[PDB]
Amino acid sequence: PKFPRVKNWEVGSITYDTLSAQAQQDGPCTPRRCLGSLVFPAPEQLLSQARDFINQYYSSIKRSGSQAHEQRLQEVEAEVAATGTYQLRESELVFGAKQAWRNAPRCVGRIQWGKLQVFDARDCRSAQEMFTYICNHIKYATNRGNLRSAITVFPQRCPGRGDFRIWNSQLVRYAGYRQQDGSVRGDPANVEITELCIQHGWTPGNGRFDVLPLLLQAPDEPPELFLLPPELVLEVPLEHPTLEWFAALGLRWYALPAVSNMLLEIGGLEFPAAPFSGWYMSTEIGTRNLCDNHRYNILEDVAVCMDLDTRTTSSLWKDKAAVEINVAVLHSYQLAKVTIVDHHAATASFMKHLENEQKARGGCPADWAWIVPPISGSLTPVFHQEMVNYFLSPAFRYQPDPW
Amino acid sequence: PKFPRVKNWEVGSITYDTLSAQAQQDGPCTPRRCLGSLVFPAPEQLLSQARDFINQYYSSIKRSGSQAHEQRLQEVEAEVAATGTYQLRESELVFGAKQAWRNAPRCVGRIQWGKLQVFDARDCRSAQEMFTYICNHIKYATNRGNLRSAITVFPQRCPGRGDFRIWNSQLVRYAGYRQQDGSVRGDPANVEITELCIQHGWTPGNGRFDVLPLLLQAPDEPPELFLLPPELVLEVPLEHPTLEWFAALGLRWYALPAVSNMLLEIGGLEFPAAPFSGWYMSTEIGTRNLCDNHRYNILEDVAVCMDLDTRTTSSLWKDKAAVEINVAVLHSYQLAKVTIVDHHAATASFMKHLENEQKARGGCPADWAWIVPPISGSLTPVFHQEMVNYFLSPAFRYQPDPW
Ligand code: HEM
Ligand code: HEM
Ligand SMILES: Cc1cc(N)nc2cc(-c3ccc4c(c3)CN(C)CCO4)ccc12
Ligand SMILES: Cc1cc(N)nc2cc(-c3ccc4c(c3)CN(C)CCO4)ccc12
Ligand SMILES: C[C@H](O)[C@H](O)[C@H]1CNc2nc(N)[nH]c(=O)c2N1
Ligand SMILES: C[C@H](O)[C@H](O)[C@H]1CNc2nc(N)[nH]c(=O)c2N1
Ligand SMILES: [Ca+2]
Ligand SMILES: [Ca+2]
Ligand SMILES: [Ca+2]
Ligand SMILES: [Cl-]
Ligand SMILES: [Cl-]
Ligand SMILES: [Gd]
Ligand SMILES: [Zn+2]
User: How far apart are CA B392 and CA B364, in angstroms?
Assistant: First the structure.
């Protein structure tokens, strides 16, 4: 209860999550009912979060209780007393961004958490400068297909001044053009941002894979529209290693998953614009983006081309077609020399992360429903691993739309 | 919080679960941390549970607050007064067994909950009579392959007297023989029960699909060994519709899923011996029982016979082999005229069940991790359905091993 027992049912091994008892915010579940599956769940309170964060920082460098540790706490206290807020040291920004990734319960890629390039954009002053920072991020992270995890963090929230915001949910997204019938051409997940781009002066295309422009918001200004140079946006045309007609579907996806609408919280400070990027796990593209019925929805078309019996569920035509689409994604990215990880390799690495984190901190916050991949769930080790979900800070958080 | 909002992300539809608010007991989650992924979470007290169940019963038959209702309440009160417990009427038992199934959050098959044959074995006296009840159950439920859902209810627990227990976790289980090289021949899940059968006088076999005897326990006298007549245990040899070598693997599974180690709780009364059965969803056999690494673990055997590239994860050889194993299960059961349901059909029916239960009770307790199938998760509609998990009574509960 205070220290929950956690069992792995494949191996029989047992751990106790002692870290969850330190959970700093509250989630949606109660003893009466679990809401784990739901997608969406000053000075002295600021100082409490700040002090805890400084403690985490000095612990991570094995200098807990040092003079420098004590002096930084007093320095933070003095700044909050004088200004009501404080400024992170450069080293604290880097550490805090890595901690926020480490703490993200829904991320299966966290074995990489210590390897994150942190771009400090806290002196950004305009939307134009914001765009320059974002382009340098995309160029660095993409690296001609040898992807590198990165985050750029723009100025923190402060009283008497609006937030920096990136209106787009990701730095690279395909347009979704809503038709008169209610159908969509392109990505149905992006209908709202597409219409906002048009409203703010973008001349729309009419393709299924039109890369959207960015809507960048500087403090107290309407969003400004910026087009990404096409040479900056690396894409992979999709082909299949043995189904030669697959290439004639004309499908593609982009190299760089870069989420831009989440809020980064470090030490009680809030960074509403802090886009971050890694590389794709193949099921995100091959299973969710392409096969979700409410996304590109290609499953029946692929099955029909494969000459599967789409008239009865028990032929497992959906399963067979989904598998080949995921094969196509892995083959195409590997052929293009663009970083990609399959769901077996990624979940294997996450098991090693759990072991590392059990030794380092006595547990790991993890959201089973998001860690288990959307195909072949029980064929991966994480399916059989019990998990404890809780909120630690530093953190990436959902935040309301700026419109 | 009181009435959780529940969203379907494929359709966009919204419901509010007003049934969760009536959750009688308490689960393992708290605002600090979610434990939803974990497998295992006074006459005045009995009267209170008995009272609420009788009300459920008379409400269910549209006889609320009537004379028969008022009379039954006072009869239980008087029976508790003279005995310390009370007896269900056979019709209340039928109602309660159906509600316990309806209330089971981890069961995807609950569209069928109103169709359940209840065998009243509460007059049972001995392990010999227990074996006859169980054999009648298996014969009725198997029905030469046209499976029918059923439950047999043995006498309730009572003070100063041992329980009836079925030591086996299922009525049909394959033996698990520990080999000298450390490995297991047969089903590794059943190593403990296999050794207990041998302990209690069973002459073991040496095959990979040897059906175990039953260890049956009458009150206070010890467990007795019983052999199931081979003609009563319907099995399905597994072949593949196009991979002719699949049959040569010698795989088989049994027709009847009949769980025998859970406790049934109705109106404060507890039945530690109440085996219940339905029919299989194909992923249970093809994915979990045959492909779990700690079960039969045949995935690589099949992939070698399919000439798949097993030295790289990104060939998705595990996924392709799993798909064909699941095809083999569906094809073999359909060819044998044994009832089976695929995971697409089953999850579609559960969505209809959720819709039914929203109108009837304002919600439905559902455990997302158990409802979503172990392959092709997001290809099924339940993956995109938010769910609320909570404990309602009457209920099936886990209980300690009788040894
Ligand atoms: C390096 C390779 C990475 C891989 C393979 C990876 C993989 C994933 C996957 C599969 C998800 C589930 C999202 C979905 O369902 O599509 C996810 C979520 C998430 N990832 Fe990672 N990730 C990586 C890097 C990163 C980085 C660099 C960060 C931040 C610095 C990060 C933070 C997050 C967060 C916050 C979520 C949850 C998003 C939400 O709740 O909406 N990830 N990741
Ligand atoms: C009629 C066809 C049925 C189907 C297709 C079905 C399907 C399933 C499935 C797939 C599970 C998940 C467990 C697993 O991974 O194997 C489950 C669990 C469960 N089922 Fe159903 N079931 C059926 C009938 C029944 C009946 C008749 C009852 C009781 C009267 C029942 C009660 C339960 C319970 C209590 C669980 C929870 C198991 C646990 O927590 O260990 N089911 N069922
Ligand atoms: C940094 C990073 C790397 C990576 N490889 N993937 C990521 C995926 C998300 C993500 C967050 C939410 C979300 C989805 C994906 C997709 N689902 C299908 C629908 C909408 O919900 C966030 C960050 C990622
Ligand atoms: C009535 C019925 C019908 C049906 N078709 N399946 C059922 C499955 C269970 C079940 C019970 C426990 C359990 C598991 C499944 C799953 N795995 C194998 C881990 C072990 O835990 C119980 C009753 C079922
Ligand atoms: C209803 C359900 O919680 C929702 O569809 C979740 C399930 N698990 C997921 N898991 C991942 N990785 N990504 C998702 O978007 C979702 N969606
Ligand atoms: C840890 C995890 O909750 C556990 O292994 C669950 C996951 N989902 C499951 N789902 C079903 N249907 N059956 C199971 O045994 C499990 N096991
Ligand atoms: Ca300063
Ligand atoms: Ca009778
Ligand atoms: Ca080979
Ligand atoms: Cl994506
Ligand atoms: Cl089973
Ligand atoms: Gd070909
Ligand atoms: Zn929970």
Answer: 10
